[PDB]
């Protein structure tokens, strides 16, 4: 990669949620192996974010690689209309077996946002088919479900800037963010808001959608599992669908295979993505129950009306079959337990820093929330110089490393965090 | 693959737009090479639809393979937030260069639908930054743009069954479907609808969005390029953005590199996907102008508010690069030219079949439109028994084969189509 390649990138290539007139610096990666990213100039970085961009088994994993390569020898892609293949069946068998019993019908898709769109369509088609006038979604504030329009309509209105689309996006019901912590105690006062809303709109709610236990992009919030239990029972009593969005929390991230395990409840609809392919390439899945899947197909449309071009992509399905196989061993449970301990123990000191507002850890996720917003360019440069790759945002410095990370690499990550929040050098902007 | 796998699929695996309570057989494939699909049982089928599912250089193409495997050895994926890489830069270079000049800013994404969502978002944020109250889209009937909510909002309301969501989807403006054919003459009566709508809502319209020349999933319609000429001008006069959705037409499919080339116009926003990666795996791109990209970045938000987890995926960008490099040889122009001729020539006779209403052809797209709907299960089986894979829908039997297809393979495809519409056996 030349400097001219870099100039081209800056002037012509958009990047996630970042300015094209006032763009901050980017770092050129030429390859990756194990737990490290390798930049163009040869520097190696221990990646602390890997799992959040789905790389729970690190990079250049031999099994993942062999699987992808082999499937390429057989067939990278083939359409899924009127056709089926070994990789999609192996994957759906795994998805069905590993998730709660009632989740037995799978709709494969390309991305997480689409997976949420699908869930949202399912709920609406479901009630259309049963002749009920239900088009509203009840969610929590601080939730995040993707960037496409329907997904956006259940994202927190303040965090996602709904004033930008005011009059374009449908208006859903937003109950207050869960206050009870995962670490702590349950306070029944938390329920009043959700409850008030349920009463006023019980007859028009199509589904309760939430990220279980961890609210990711909307604040790395970690709340009490009793919440899920209450929501399931309320949905049970009122006859409402519950969508659980586990695109971020699935496949071991919170210490359990699925965050809903923390409460021993099953949603009617489950969204999955990210770690699903072990972070090799995009793929997603929306699981639902026989009752929903069948009901939808018995209505006016004769089917569930959705179906992406690359649906069921064999290359991506193989990658995921290999990713789930690594999890089959069960080694991750302990890998994460140990990562969980090391994060609590090694992030604790941040509770002593002037710039810190709170610290919280759950599974492979460690968050250090700061009092003031970070300076993106300056803090990013700092981390790179420590030989680590950590990507903050807003008032959040968080880690979610590969489950395979050696204690020596995780220690380097935590020290870099602890060092970044000691004074105000890297804060504000 | 065993029969229990097949039983599992039926019972647990949803497929595109199809019932879970009354699914139709699905055929199990174990591999593919050149232009053939290889069923579990050993039967080989010539694929006639490969290019519509993005596979314009066929299957198991050596150049695409090597590139993908090489990239895998470097890295399959790495996040794009604060990071860049060669596959992403080579791709965006090629995309900027091969599209009209004003299109020089690339938002890479995962899938076509999302690419359309990106465009629509781009348009709304643009006007928002300018302080104008413009939230409606003007499109055309029989248009199809994806299955996500926003994309659905600009799809033909009849074709996509909007009543299901009546009250949830925003109500946009639908000009009538274009009547003038790509084969035929221009008729100016075609404009009145559009003009009446523009006159009444010019002040609230954020953008015009359409599929150029060919309207795919909404009817495989082939209309006159003057339409694009006219729309580009009105939008220019009124200050309105034009979005061109070339997810299905891009990369040589209509005989030009991009169907816009047929009318000699450039849109403000361009959506690409499907053949972008030579049909190996999913990827998408949305290009726009500097005026649009910058204006968005200077508004309230300070940037364009979007960013998928797998944005910029190196593996898919590698594939795409290897696919565009094949197109660089120019060989596709002659390949598609010939396929266009062979298709016109060999489907012509279907015009005389009683089950047929219209035969139209453009580039590597050949369509036989029938008078009644096809018998899905029965026709699919017929095709498979002829050793070909043809996937019809509604009243449409179409082919869109890989550009590398041999005249003999193509002829087997055209022979099957003409045979299929020869009586009502396979209809209703
Ligand atoms: C014109 C057009 N736009 C958008 C799409 C959406 O593509 P996908 O279903 O991959 O999201 C398609 C799919 O074929 C298409 O043909
Ligand atoms: C809970 C949750 N849902 C949905 C998404 C959307 O995933 P994608 O950005 O791939 O569309 C994310 C992305 O991080 C997420 O964390
Ligand atoms: Na299950
Ligand atoms: Na260009």
PDB file of C-alpha atoms in Angstrom, chain B residues 8 20 24 40 50-51 56 75 107 123 139 165 191 245 247 250 257 261 332 359 374-375 378 387 399 414 421-423:
ATOM      1  CA  UNK B   8     -34.606 -31.410   7.961  1.00  0.00           C
ATOM      2  CA  UNK B  20     -43.060 -23.072   5.371  1.00  0.00           C
ATOM      3  CA  UNK B  24     -41.988 -26.999  -3.044  1.00  0.00           C
ATOM      4  CA  UNK B  40     -26.136 -34.654  -5.177  1.00  0.00           C
ATOM      5  CA  UNK B  50     -26.484 -17.698 -13.100  1.00  0.00           C
ATOM      6  CA  UNK B  51     -26.006 -13.960 -13.864  1.00  0.00           C
ATOM      7  CA  UNK B  56     -21.449 -13.747 -14.712  1.00  0.00           C
ATOM      8  CA  UNK B  75      -6.955 -12.003   6.138  1.00  0.00           C
ATOM      9  CA  UNK B 107     -20.058   3.594   0.574  1.00  0.00           C
ATOM     10  CA  UNK B 123     -31.079  11.667   0.178  1.00  0.00           C
ATOM     11  CA  UNK B 139     -40.515   6.329  -8.210  1.00  0.00           C
ATOM     12  CA  UNK B 165     -48.098  -2.961   6.128  1.00  0.00           C
ATOM     13  CA  UNK B 191     -44.492  11.434 -19.489  1.00  0.00           C
ATOM     14  CA  UNK B 245     -30.568   1.255  -8.710  1.00  0.00           C
ATOM     15  CA  UNK B 247     -28.009  -3.788  -8.481  1.00  0.00           C
ATOM     16  CA  UNK B 250     -24.743  -3.341 -13.494  1.00  0.00           C
ATOM     17  CA  UNK B 257     -21.146  -1.636 -18.511  1.00  0.00           C
ATOM     18  CA  UNK B 261     -24.779   4.313 -20.367  1.00  0.00           C
ATOM     19  CA  UNK B 332     -17.582  -9.380 -21.915  1.00  0.00           C
ATOM     20  CA  UNK B 359     -40.609 -11.993 -26.178  1.00  0.00           C
ATOM     21  CA  UNK B 374     -46.570 -21.147 -14.654  1.00  0.00           C
ATOM     22  CA  UNK B 375     -46.998 -24.297 -12.662  1.00  0.00           C
ATOM     23  CA  UNK B 378     -44.189 -28.994 -12.665  1.00  0.00           C
ATOM     24  CA  UNK B 387     -30.502 -31.084 -17.714  1.00  0.00           C
ATOM     25  CA  UNK B 399     -32.699 -16.528 -18.903  1.00  0.00           C
ATOM     26  CA  UNK B 414     -33.316 -21.863 -25.466  1.00  0.00           C
ATOM     27  CA  UNK B 421     -44.315 -22.987 -23.712  1.00  0.00           C
ATOM     28  CA  UNK B 422     -45.291 -25.295 -26.577  1.00  0.00           C
ATOM     29  CA  UNK B 423     -48.544 -26.290 -24.661  1.00  0.00           C
TER      30      UNK B 423
END
